[PDB]
Amino acid sequence: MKKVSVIMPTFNNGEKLHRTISSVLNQTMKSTDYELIIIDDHSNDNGETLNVIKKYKGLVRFKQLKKNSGNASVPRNTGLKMSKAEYVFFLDSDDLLHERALEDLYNYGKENNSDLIIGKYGVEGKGRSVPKAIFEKGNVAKADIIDNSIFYALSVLKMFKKSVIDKNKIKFKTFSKTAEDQLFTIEFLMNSKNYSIKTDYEYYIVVNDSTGNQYFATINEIYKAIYKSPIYKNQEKRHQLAGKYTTRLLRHGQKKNFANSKMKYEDKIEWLNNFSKTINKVPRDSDKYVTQIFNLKLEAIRQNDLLAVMIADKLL
Amino acid sequence: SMKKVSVIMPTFNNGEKLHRTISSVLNQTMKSTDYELIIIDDHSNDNGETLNVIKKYKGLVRFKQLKKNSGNASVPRNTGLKMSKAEYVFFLDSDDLLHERALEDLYNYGKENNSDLIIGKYGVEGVPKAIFEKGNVAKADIIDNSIFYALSVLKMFKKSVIDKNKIKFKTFSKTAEDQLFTIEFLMNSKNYSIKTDYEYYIVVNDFSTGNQYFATINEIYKAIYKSPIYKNQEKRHQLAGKYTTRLLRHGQKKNFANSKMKYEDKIEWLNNFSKTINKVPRDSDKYVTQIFNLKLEAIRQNDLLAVMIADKLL
Amino acid sequence: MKKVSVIMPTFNNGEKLHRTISSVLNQTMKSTDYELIIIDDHSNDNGETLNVIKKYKGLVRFKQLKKNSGNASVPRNTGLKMSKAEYVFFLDSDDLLHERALEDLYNYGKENNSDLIIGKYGVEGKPKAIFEKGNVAKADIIDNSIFYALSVLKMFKKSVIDKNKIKFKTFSKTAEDQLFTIEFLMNSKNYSIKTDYEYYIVVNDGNQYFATINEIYKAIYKSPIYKNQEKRHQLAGKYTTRLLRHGQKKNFANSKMKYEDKIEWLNNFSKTINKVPRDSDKYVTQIFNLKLEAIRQNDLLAVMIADKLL
Ligand SMILES: CC(=O)N[C@H]1[C@@H](OP(=O)(O)OP(=O)(O)OC[C@H]2O[C@@H](n3ccc(=O)[nH]c3=O)[C@H](O)[C@@H]2O)O[C@H](CO)[C@@H](O)[C@@H]1O
Ligand SMILES: CC(=O)N[C@H]1[C@@H](OP(=O)(O)OP(=O)(O)OC[C@H]2O[C@@H](n3ccc(=O)[nH]c3=O)[C@H](O)[C@@H]2O)O[C@H](CO)[C@@H](O)[C@@H]1O
Ligand SMILES: CC(=O)N[C@H]1[C@@H](OP(=O)(O)OP(=O)(O)OC[C@H]2O[C@@H](n3ccc(=O)[nH]c3=O)[C@H](O)[C@@H]2O)O[C@H](CO)[C@@H](O)[C@@H]1O
Ligand SMILES: [Cl-]
Ligand SMILES: [Cl-]
Ligand SMILES: [Cl-]
Ligand SMILES: [Cl-]
Ligand SMILES: [Cl-]
Ligand SMILES: [Cl-]
Ligand SMILES: [Cl-]
Ligand SMILES: [Cl-]
Ligand SMILES: [Cl-]
Ligand SMILES: [Cl-]
Ligand SMILES: [Mg+2]
Ligand SMILES: [Mn+2]
Ligand SMILES: [Mn+2]
Ligand SMILES: [Mn+2]
Ligand SMILES: [Mn+2]
Ligand SMILES: [Mn+2]
Ligand SMILES: [Mn+2]
Ligand SMILES: [Mn+2]
């Protein structure tokens, strides 16, 4: 049994993929103690990506899917079924591991009996920032969702204990183009107790290059996961987690400032209708846990009142 | 010889503390024989302590015990009103104190000015202010002398006004019923006096749906609009508008909309507020201070989001 | 056929009317090339105004209406019927012309085949953007801020008015001047701006209104000049901005107006704007986004709030 399976979906990466693969093959961890599983989402780039992957045959595991699934969910699911390792680690095909990543995160996980180990993110190139608050206290052996700001760091680019994923049948959902990764991490968090944060190096380097129907169905599943948590079973604790998530959603959600945007009126109405429908399935008891500057915006969404959202946004 | 003044004092589980309040009444500059203290005990159950105190003034006070606890001052004060045949009554709460000159100074001033109502300045151990800023006022006015801001019943009232108009404390509300008594009295009389030479009444400080509260507020507006004294309809609008301003400034839970109250309770509160103000003619709104323009409209529209916004813009 | 008819409605002006009439009669333009048409709206000032007009017997054309119409519309329509000139110029009876006004505006119009010539306004006592660039031979409604200078105190080519039967509306005591100018603009192509002097000196001492505004949007959307649907959206949206910036009772919502009157006003406003395509909304200045939506939604509270945030 391997200590770690790195699961990397690929799609039309071509020759750029060498760099990412090299970052995985040059780990300080013993080569026999881990594997890289590459799942190619039926690249169509005149054989370029597949030709790159074939240069590592015998050093990696590899499967190609019959048709392109359109995002990381199915390829990542395919990888989970292939791994019988202790931990998995999701790596995107454009990012880079620090050479110490697998060894340090695994060791720290083992030491602290962690279900989830989060390594500090670095960045290559201007663009999207990476989470910062989660890493501001240094290393944390047993982290808290709320105190360590985990709802602001919900990518799957982390080390997850495989047995939690297996026992709880946790899979990536395939019906939405956005927030699926948040849902997977939340489902994991709600079924596990022990989370660790490792900050000694920048272990994972992020490289930078709708009507809301599907999106708000995904958000609905996040709230459902919280309210069914077997770990966080106290009802008031669920309200608190749900309120903290609502705060995160209002702070960083898709099209968060749609109301005063250049979106067509008809599209605003449909967007807000979906948003309102989803939030109205969340108990109002969670609302007292939302940061209070958002009190009006949140009520306006509940009331499905576009004028009131517009006004709330002018006052924020 | 009818008494000049009946002091009406409800009691409930005061204990030894009560001596001080009784003594403040029994030591007056007014001739002892010209006033009486009527004590109505609201079924104390403090191991006989309150009753033992009252028993020490047997023969110096009139006393009635109620056989079940009413739960507030209304039923005891009404009992007191039935018992008094005096020219004026004065409501004293069982934890407060009268200045030794209170009955004589207020009664004499009332007699000199043919006053229906005399208001003595309040002091505090551990109260309204604008009403008392102008010195003594022989013939005061509700709006000009800020009387809507001093509506407690801890005042001297002419008994004939209470009797003729059958004015009683309501017992359907645990809040604002005192304001209603004073409003009903003001709406049925003309001559009000303010006396400030001394802190005549000393307040001792110690360490919901809206259904009843707003039922009481409803009765205040109905008193104004049915006044046999203030009969002119524009004067009614002015008084109602001035009351509305007082309510928005100092009313219960005035900032409910952005508060920590549960949503269902906000909706019930505002439904109550909205339906009550919507019975008040919009002609009164021009008399409300302009800063409240949006908040008052939002309340009339029964629109919680608008009330939230109005409060954020204030 | 005269070059210019100056059309001047009068009503209870009195002795001060002398100063105005002589500003017309002392033009640099050849005396026989222009005419002053005075239309008295049945003055009732004990003959004072009439007595002034009478002194110019033989130097002006004059018609008195049998009854006071209440405003300039009917008298101006009367003036239009009486004039067979190349151009008309509307002059209010309390205002003044610069001696160079008719000559300079006409020559500039003739030079540039203008349908409309706008002279720079001056003031006596206690629109600007249109004049800030100096003379413009062929102006653009949007770029030269014409929607902000919609008075009829300008030189208009008579044939345009005749051929399109353009008349002042009598059923609105407000905004009828705007509608005239807009109907003219939407049925003509060549507009000129002249700025060498302050040519025209202004002296300073909802059912019908929104019916008029409705006609403004209809004039734009049925324009035989501006036939492209997107251009029509652009013009409508720019007009919406002008309406929100300078419209009658623009701040009605937080005003001392009776609630019932606020509701009726907004209801008319809402009804009118909801006949205007939402495609026009993107061309409205972004600060008005909330106010404009509040009006479309017929939501008085939202209009009150919108005003407080402007
Ligand atoms: C800043 C941010 O929000 N980043 C997120 C974004 O990254 P980002 O926008 O960089 O997504 P990438 O392009 O890196 O794609 C993510 C992974 O999906 C694979 N892929 C892509 C297309 C396809 O049809 N099939 C397929 O398997 C890629 O090869 C890659 O391994 O989306 C990723 C996928 O949810 C998340 O992990 C990242 O956290
Ligand atoms: C700052 C303020 O808002 N003060 C008011 C408040 O005073 P406060 O909160 O101090 O009320 P008190 O405790 O004085 O009680 C009022 C009177 O009611 C009596 N009592 C109490 C309980 C009971 O079951 N039965 C009974 O008769 C008390 O003995 C006392 O005589 O409420 C009083 C009663 O409306 C008003 O007169 C005061 O103006
Ligand atoms: C600053 C401003 O917005 N000024 C406008 C305002 O001028 P203002 O408010 O100054 O109106 P005036 O007093 O100039 O009257 C306009 C003209 O109408 C005539 N009149 C008046 C009363 C009457 O019953 N019948 C009649 O024909 C006047 O004599 C005058 O010739 O209204 C005029 C007519 O809409 C517009 O041309 C002006 O641009
Ligand atoms: Cl993250
Ligand atoms: Cl999101
Ligand atoms: Cl005395
Ligand atoms: Cl008064
Ligand atoms: Cl008081
Ligand atoms: Cl209540
Ligand atoms: Cl009256
Ligand atoms: Cl109150
Ligand atoms: Cl007043
Ligand atoms: Cl206007
Ligand atoms: Mg004595
Ligand atoms: Mn990436
Ligand atoms: Mn990329
Ligand atoms: Mn609303
Ligand atoms: Mn008390
Ligand atoms: Mn007390
Ligand atoms: Mn004028
Ligand atoms: Mn004038």
mmCIF file with all atom_site columns, C-alpha atoms in Angstrom, chain A residues 72-205:
data_model
loop_
_atom_site.group_PDB
_atom_site.id
_atom_site.type_symbol
_atom_site.label_atom_id
_atom_site.label_alt_id
_atom_site.label_comp_id
_atom_site.label_asym_id
_atom_site.label_entity_id
_atom_site.label_seq_id
_atom_site.pdbx_PDB_ins_code
_atom_site.Cartn_x
_atom_site.Cartn_y
_atom_site.Cartn_z
_atom_site.occupancy
_atom_site.B_iso_or_equiv
_atom_site.pdbx_formal_charge
_atom_site.auth_seq_id
_atom_site.auth_comp_id
_atom_site.auth_asym_id
_atom_site.auth_atom_id
_atom_site.pdbx_PDB_model_num
ATOM 1   C CA . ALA A 1 72  ? -11.701 17.599 -13.496 1.00 0.00 ? 72  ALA A CA 1
ATOM 2   C CA . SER A 1 73  ? -14.638 15.760 -11.807 1.00 0.00 ? 73  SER A CA 1
ATOM 3   C CA . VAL A 1 74  ? -14.807 12.431 -13.793 1.00 0.00 ? 74  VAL A CA 1
ATOM 4   C CA . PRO A 1 75  ? -10.987 12.113 -14.286 1.00 0.00 ? 75  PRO A CA 1
ATOM 5   C CA . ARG A 1 76  ? -10.484 12.771 -10.548 1.00 0.00 ? 76  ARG A CA 1
ATOM 6   C CA . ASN A 1 77  ? -13.219 10.193 -9.733  1.00 0.00 ? 77  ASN A CA 1
ATOM 7   C CA . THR A 1 78  ? -11.452 7.703  -12.068 1.00 0.00 ? 78  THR A CA 1
ATOM 8   C CA . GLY A 1 79  ? -8.187  8.328  -10.125 1.00 0.00 ? 79  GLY A CA 1
ATOM 9   C CA . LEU A 1 80  ? -9.849  7.723  -6.704  1.00 0.00 ? 80  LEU A CA 1
ATOM 10  C CA . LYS A 1 81  ? -11.060 4.243  -7.833  1.00 0.00 ? 81  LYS A CA 1
ATOM 11  C CA . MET A 1 82  ? -7.511  3.427  -9.058  1.00 0.00 ? 82  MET A CA 1
ATOM 12  C CA . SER A 1 83  ? -5.745  4.428  -5.801  1.00 0.00 ? 83  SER A CA 1
ATOM 13  C CA . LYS A 1 84  ? -5.482  1.998  -2.899  1.00 0.00 ? 84  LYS A CA 1
ATOM 14  C CA . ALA A 1 85  ? -3.080  4.379  -1.113  1.00 0.00 ? 85  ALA A CA 1
ATOM 15  C CA . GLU A 1 86  ? -3.297  5.735  2.456   1.00 0.00 ? 86  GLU A CA 1
ATOM 16  C CA . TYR A 1 87  ? -3.689  9.331  1.226   1.00 0.00 ? 87  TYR A CA 1
ATOM 17  C CA . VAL A 1 88  ? -4.532  10.962 -2.099  1.00 0.00 ? 88  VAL A CA 1
ATOM 18  C CA . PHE A 1 89  ? -3.310  14.338 -3.313  1.00 0.00 ? 89  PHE A CA 1
ATOM 19  C CA . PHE A 1 90  ? -5.017  16.210 -6.162  1.00 0.00 ? 90  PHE A CA 1
ATOM 20  C CA . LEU A 1 91  ? -2.604  18.005 -8.488  1.00 0.00 ? 91  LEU A CA 1
ATOM 21  C CA . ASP A 1 92  ? -3.792  20.089 -11.446 1.00 0.00 ? 92  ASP A CA 1
ATOM 22  C CA . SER A 1 93  ? -1.842  19.497 -14.684 1.00 0.00 ? 93  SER A CA 1
ATOM 23  C CA . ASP A 1 94  ? -0.606  23.124 -14.863 1.00 0.00 ? 94  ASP A CA 1
ATOM 24  C CA . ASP A 1 95  ? 0.685   23.483 -11.202 1.00 0.00 ? 95  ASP A CA 1
ATOM 25  C CA . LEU A 1 96  ? 3.976   22.483 -9.438  1.00 0.00 ? 96  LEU A CA 1
ATOM 26  C CA . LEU A 1 97  ? 4.798   20.533 -6.249  1.00 0.00 ? 97  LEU A CA 1
ATOM 27  C CA . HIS A 1 98  ? 7.640   21.605 -3.975  1.00 0.00 ? 98  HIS A CA 1
ATOM 28  C CA . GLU A 1 99  ? 10.167  18.691 -3.819  1.00 0.00 ? 99  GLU A CA 1
ATOM 29  C CA . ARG A 1 100 ? 9.354   18.269 -0.067  1.00 0.00 ? 100 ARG A CA 1
ATOM 30  C CA . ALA A 1 101 ? 5.538   18.357 -0.546  1.00 0.00 ? 101 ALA A CA 1
ATOM 31  C CA . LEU A 1 102 ? 4.597   14.670 -0.318  1.00 0.00 ? 102 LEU A CA 1
ATOM 32  C CA . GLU A 1 103 ? 7.123   13.741 2.440   1.00 0.00 ? 103 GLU A CA 1
ATOM 33  C CA . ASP A 1 104 ? 6.445   16.713 4.770   1.00 0.00 ? 104 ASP A CA 1
ATOM 34  C CA . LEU A 1 105 ? 2.628   16.704 4.386   1.00 0.00 ? 105 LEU A CA 1
ATOM 35  C CA . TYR A 1 106 ? 2.412   12.901 4.754   1.00 0.00 ? 106 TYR A CA 1
ATOM 36  C CA . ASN A 1 107 ? 4.765   12.853 7.816   1.00 0.00 ? 107 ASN A CA 1
ATOM 37  C CA . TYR A 1 108 ? 2.805   15.693 9.511   1.00 0.00 ? 108 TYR A CA 1
ATOM 38  C CA . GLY A 1 109 ? -0.485  13.909 8.733   1.00 0.00 ? 109 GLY A CA 1
ATOM 39  C CA . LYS A 1 110 ? 0.819   10.609 10.138  1.00 0.00 ? 110 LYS A CA 1
ATOM 40  C CA . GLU A 1 111 ? 2.171   12.328 13.295  1.00 0.00 ? 111 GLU A CA 1
ATOM 41  C CA . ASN A 1 112 ? -1.154  14.127 13.992  1.00 0.00 ? 112 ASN A CA 1
ATOM 42  C CA . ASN A 1 113 ? -3.483  11.380 12.724  1.00 0.00 ? 113 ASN A CA 1
ATOM 43  C CA . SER A 1 114 ? -4.800  13.880 10.108  1.00 0.00 ? 114 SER A CA 1
ATOM 44  C CA . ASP A 1 115 ? -7.725  13.205 7.745   1.00 0.00 ? 115 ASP A CA 1
ATOM 45  C CA . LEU A 1 116 ? -6.728  16.322 5.742   1.00 0.00 ? 116 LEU A CA 1
ATOM 46  C CA . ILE A 1 117 ? -3.351  18.081 5.433   1.00 0.00 ? 117 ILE A CA 1
ATOM 47  C CA . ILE A 1 118 ? -3.188  21.506 3.810   1.00 0.00 ? 118 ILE A CA 1
ATOM 48  C CA . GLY A 1 119 ? 0.151   22.781 2.518   1.00 0.00 ? 119 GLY A CA 1
ATOM 49  C CA . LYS A 1 120 ? 0.714   26.519 2.085   1.00 0.00 ? 120 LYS A CA 1
ATOM 50  C CA . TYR A 1 121 ? 0.138   27.663 -1.523  1.00 0.00 ? 121 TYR A CA 1
ATOM 51  C CA . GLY A 1 122 ? 2.593   29.624 -3.603  1.00 0.00 ? 122 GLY A CA 1
ATOM 52  C CA . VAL A 1 123 ? 1.903   31.407 -6.877  1.00 0.00 ? 123 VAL A CA 1
ATOM 53  C CA . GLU A 1 124 ? 3.554   31.739 -10.304 1.00 0.00 ? 124 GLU A CA 1
ATOM 54  C CA . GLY A 1 125 ? 2.467   34.782 -12.381 1.00 0.00 ? 125 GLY A CA 1
ATOM 55  C CA . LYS A 1 126 ? 0.065   37.700 -11.685 1.00 0.00 ? 126 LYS A CA 1
ATOM 56  C CA . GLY A 1 127 ? -3.711  36.860 -11.583 1.00 0.00 ? 127 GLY A CA 1
ATOM 57  C CA . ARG A 1 128 ? -5.769  34.909 -9.002  1.00 0.00 ? 128 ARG A CA 1
ATOM 58  C CA . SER A 1 129 ? -4.420  35.152 -5.428  1.00 0.00 ? 129 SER A CA 1
ATOM 59  C CA . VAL A 1 130 ? -4.247  32.041 -3.205  1.00 0.00 ? 130 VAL A CA 1
ATOM 60  C CA . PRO A 1 131 ? -5.693  31.670 0.366   1.00 0.00 ? 131 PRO A CA 1
ATOM 61  C CA . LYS A 1 132 ? -3.684  33.454 3.097   1.00 0.00 ? 132 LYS A CA 1
ATOM 62  C CA . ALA A 1 133 ? -5.719  33.589 6.366   1.00 0.00 ? 133 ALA A CA 1
ATOM 63  C CA . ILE A 1 134 ? -5.554  29.775 6.826   1.00 0.00 ? 134 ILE A CA 1
ATOM 64  C CA . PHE A 1 135 ? -1.726  29.963 6.884   1.00 0.00 ? 135 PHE A CA 1
ATOM 65  C CA . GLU A 1 136 ? -1.317  33.098 9.092   1.00 0.00 ? 136 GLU A CA 1
ATOM 66  C CA . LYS A 1 137 ? -0.799  31.139 12.388  1.00 0.00 ? 137 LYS A CA 1
ATOM 67  C CA . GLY A 1 138 ? 1.988   28.841 11.156  1.00 0.00 ? 138 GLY A CA 1
ATOM 68  C CA . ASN A 1 139 ? 1.673   25.079 11.540  1.00 0.00 ? 139 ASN A CA 1
ATOM 69  C CA . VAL A 1 140 ? -1.554  23.770 13.101  1.00 0.00 ? 140 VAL A CA 1
ATOM 70  C CA . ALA A 1 141 ? -1.821  20.108 14.114  1.00 0.00 ? 141 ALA A CA 1
ATOM 71  C CA . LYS A 1 142 ? -5.585  20.103 14.810  1.00 0.00 ? 142 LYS A CA 1
ATOM 72  C CA . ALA A 1 143 ? -7.235  23.002 12.965  1.00 0.00 ? 143 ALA A CA 1
ATOM 73  C CA . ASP A 1 144 ? -10.749 24.407 13.325  1.00 0.00 ? 144 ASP A CA 1
ATOM 74  C CA . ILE A 1 145 ? -12.973 25.194 10.309  1.00 0.00 ? 145 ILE A CA 1
ATOM 75  C CA . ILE A 1 146 ? -13.923 28.590 11.786  1.00 0.00 ? 146 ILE A CA 1
ATOM 76  C CA . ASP A 1 147 ? -10.788 29.709 13.696  1.00 0.00 ? 147 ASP A CA 1
ATOM 77  C CA . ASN A 1 148 ? -8.443  28.701 10.830  1.00 0.00 ? 148 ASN A CA 1
ATOM 78  C CA . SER A 1 149 ? -10.626 30.062 8.034   1.00 0.00 ? 149 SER A CA 1
ATOM 79  C CA . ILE A 1 150 ? -10.931 26.731 6.148   1.00 0.00 ? 150 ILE A CA 1
ATOM 80  C CA . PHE A 1 151 ? -14.107 27.848 4.287   1.00 0.00 ? 151 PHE A CA 1
ATOM 81  C CA . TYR A 1 152 ? -11.843 30.322 2.425   1.00 0.00 ? 152 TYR A CA 1
ATOM 82  C CA . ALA A 1 153 ? -9.514  27.515 1.215   1.00 0.00 ? 153 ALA A CA 1
ATOM 83  C CA . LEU A 1 154 ? -11.832 24.928 -0.281  1.00 0.00 ? 154 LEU A CA 1
ATOM 84  C CA . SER A 1 155 ? -9.796  23.743 -3.324  1.00 0.00 ? 155 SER A CA 1
ATOM 85  C CA . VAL A 1 156 ? -9.056  20.012 -3.419  1.00 0.00 ? 156 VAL A CA 1
ATOM 86  C CA . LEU A 1 157 ? -5.313  20.790 -3.883  1.00 0.00 ? 157 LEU A CA 1
ATOM 87  C CA . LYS A 1 158 ? -4.568  19.108 -0.566  1.00 0.00 ? 158 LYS A CA 1
ATOM 88  C CA . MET A 1 159 ? -3.743  15.705 0.989   1.00 0.00 ? 159 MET A CA 1
ATOM 89  C CA . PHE A 1 160 ? -6.886  13.671 1.866   1.00 0.00 ? 160 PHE A CA 1
ATOM 90  C CA . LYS A 1 161 ? -7.058  10.352 3.813   1.00 0.00 ? 161 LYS A CA 1
ATOM 91  C CA . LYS A 1 162 ? -8.423  7.780  1.353   1.00 0.00 ? 162 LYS A CA 1
ATOM 92  C CA . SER A 1 163 ? -10.484 5.724  3.874   1.00 0.00 ? 163 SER A CA 1
ATOM 93  C CA . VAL A 1 164 ? -12.708 8.772  4.601   1.00 0.00 ? 164 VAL A CA 1
ATOM 94  C CA . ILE A 1 165 ? -13.372 9.115  0.851   1.00 0.00 ? 165 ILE A CA 1
ATOM 95  C CA . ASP A 1 166 ? -14.053 5.306  0.506   1.00 0.00 ? 166 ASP A CA 1
ATOM 96  C CA . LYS A 1 167 ? -16.230 4.736  3.620   1.00 0.00 ? 167 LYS A CA 1
ATOM 97  C CA . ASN A 1 168 ? -18.356 7.849  2.884   1.00 0.00 ? 168 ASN A CA 1
ATOM 98  C CA . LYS A 1 169 ? -18.576 7.216  -0.917  1.00 0.00 ? 169 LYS A CA 1
ATOM 99  C CA . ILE A 1 170 ? -17.316 10.754 -1.601  1.00 0.00 ? 170 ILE A CA 1
ATOM 100 C CA . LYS A 1 171 ? -17.192 11.522 -5.315  1.00 0.00 ? 171 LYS A CA 1
ATOM 101 C CA . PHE A 1 172 ? -16.908 14.684 -7.383  1.00 0.00 ? 172 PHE A CA 1
ATOM 102 C CA . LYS A 1 173 ? -20.327 15.723 -8.683  1.00 0.00 ? 173 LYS A CA 1
ATOM 103 C CA . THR A 1 174 ? -20.635 16.099 -12.454 1.00 0.00 ? 174 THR A CA 1
ATOM 104 C CA . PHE A 1 175 ? -23.732 18.345 -13.016 1.00 0.00 ? 175 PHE A CA 1
ATOM 105 C CA . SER A 1 176 ? -22.087 21.766 -12.503 1.00 0.00 ? 176 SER A CA 1
ATOM 106 C CA . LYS A 1 177 ? -19.073 23.565 -14.037 1.00 0.00 ? 177 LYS A CA 1
ATOM 107 C CA . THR A 1 178 ? -18.432 25.537 -10.803 1.00 0.00 ? 178 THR A CA 1
ATOM 108 C CA . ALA A 1 179 ? -18.209 24.931 -7.004  1.00 0.00 ? 179 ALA A CA 1
ATOM 109 C CA . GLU A 1 180 ? -17.887 21.074 -7.406  1.00 0.00 ? 180 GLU A CA 1
ATOM 110 C CA . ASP A 1 181 ? -14.452 21.259 -5.767  1.00 0.00 ? 181 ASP A CA 1
ATOM 111 C CA . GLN A 1 182 ? -15.900 23.250 -2.816  1.00 0.00 ? 182 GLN A CA 1
ATOM 112 C CA . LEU A 1 183 ? -18.608 20.600 -2.424  1.00 0.00 ? 183 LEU A CA 1
ATOM 113 C CA . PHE A 1 184 ? -16.058 17.745 -2.373  1.00 0.00 ? 184 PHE A CA 1
ATOM 114 C CA . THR A 1 185 ? -13.892 19.489 0.273   1.00 0.00 ? 185 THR A CA 1
ATOM 115 C CA . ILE A 1 186 ? -16.983 20.380 2.386   1.00 0.00 ? 186 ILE A CA 1
ATOM 116 C CA . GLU A 1 187 ? -18.341 16.770 2.130   1.00 0.00 ? 187 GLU A CA 1
ATOM 117 C CA . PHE A 1 188 ? -14.891 15.618 3.292   1.00 0.00 ? 188 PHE A CA 1
ATOM 118 C CA . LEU A 1 189 ? -14.724 18.164 6.191   1.00 0.00 ? 189 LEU A CA 1
ATOM 119 C CA . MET A 1 190 ? -18.231 17.215 7.401   1.00 0.00 ? 190 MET A CA 1
ATOM 120 C CA . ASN A 1 191 ? -17.205 13.517 7.570   1.00 0.00 ? 191 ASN A CA 1
ATOM 121 C CA . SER A 1 192 ? -13.796 13.991 9.262   1.00 0.00 ? 192 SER A CA 1
ATOM 122 C CA . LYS A 1 193 ? -12.399 15.422 12.519  1.00 0.00 ? 193 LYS A CA 1
ATOM 123 C CA . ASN A 1 194 ? -8.650  15.967 12.206  1.00 0.00 ? 194 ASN A CA 1
ATOM 124 C CA . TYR A 1 195 ? -7.279  18.677 9.904   1.00 0.00 ? 195 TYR A CA 1
ATOM 125 C CA . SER A 1 196 ? -3.646  19.836 9.759   1.00 0.00 ? 196 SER A CA 1
ATOM 126 C CA . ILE A 1 197 ? -1.992  22.932 8.223   1.00 0.00 ? 197 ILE A CA 1
ATOM 127 C CA . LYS A 1 198 ? 1.661   22.881 7.152   1.00 0.00 ? 198 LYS A CA 1
ATOM 128 C CA . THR A 1 199 ? 3.415   26.196 6.346   1.00 0.00 ? 199 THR A CA 1
ATOM 129 C CA . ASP A 1 200 ? 7.223   25.588 6.375   1.00 0.00 ? 200 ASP A CA 1
ATOM 130 C CA . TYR A 1 201 ? 7.487   25.947 2.551   1.00 0.00 ? 201 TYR A CA 1
ATOM 131 C CA . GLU A 1 202 ? 5.221   26.968 -0.311  1.00 0.00 ? 202 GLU A CA 1
ATOM 132 C CA . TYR A 1 203 ? 4.418   23.304 -0.969  1.00 0.00 ? 203 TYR A CA 1
ATOM 133 C CA . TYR A 1 204 ? 1.921   23.747 -3.858  1.00 0.00 ? 204 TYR A CA 1
ATOM 134 C CA . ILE A 1 205 ? 2.568   26.411 -6.523  1.00 0.00 ? 205 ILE A CA 1
#
